[PDB]
């Protein structure tokens, strides 16, 4: 499987207050993320979390003090999800119901997505209670996905990984991972490369100065809709570096993975 995530929160605020909190961009930025423009019927917008993560949004309907219906794509490359935020007033509280569906969603994604929406509605409730910002500053793990056609090119082959990953060999076997932007470091040591052809890829990326290594898992899951290529890159919060160093690394690597997923989509065309 059931791709349809449904989450609810009940808050002791009136419907009009909750509606403002989920539509006014100044308020939305206190608990959810930064909107490039308010949601408007038939118009596109974008929400940015300040850490490299974002969704591109197309808004289908805005019904005041009732509901928001929109579609979005994680990092601009993920499959389109149908999202609904619906308010129901009560004698005790206002209920916000979140619907998030996506045809063919891997069952492996559903639990993470439910937890993600429970986090977001928990931040809404905190902001309504205290008036203080309840945003997270940066998310401790990187993830993303893109749906590829069921074609002849596959991203998880020794002879295709260099087509889309920012890696180079170091003797014989991938040994460097590159983050190419206007900051540094640019070159990172890659260790423990393990490729299970057309199934899964794991490796570690060392961070200069850090107390532990980061861990990367790439997988493909077949489906009627196409092959879902997914990445998880973890460890940023346990590097033993300053928070700004950890956040900056996470942000830069998130942009790198966004570019890699896009390139894989181009290769699979
Ligand atoms: Cl292989
Ligand atoms: Cl596959
Ligand atoms: Cl942890
Ligand atoms: Mg944590
Ligand atoms: Na934090």
Author numbering: 9 to 277
Kindly provide excerpts from the paper associated with this entry.
Here, we report, at a resolution of 1.5 Å, the crystal structure of DynU16, a putative di-domain protein homolo­gous to StAR-related lipid-transfer (START/Bet v1-like) domain-containing proteins.
The final model included 269 protein residues, 282 water molecules and five ions. The N-terminal (residues 1–139) and C-terminal (residues 150–283) domains are connected by a flexible ten-residue linker (140–149). Assessment of the C-terminal domain suggests divergence from the canonical START/Bet v1 fold observed in the N-terminal domain. The C-terminal domain possesses eight instead of six antiparallel β-strands and has adopted additional loops. The opposing region of the cavity is composed of aromatic residues, including Phe57, Phe63, Phe82, Phe128, Trp80, Trp125 and Tyr144. The abundance of aromatic residues localized in one region of the cavity suggests a possible role in carbocation intermediate stabilization if cyclization is catalyzed in the cavity. The cavity-forming residues frequently reside in loops or β-strands, potentially increasing cavity flexibility and enabling contraction and expansion to accommodate substantial substrate rearrangements. The shape and size of the cavity appears to support the binding of a linear or perhaps a cyclic polyene.
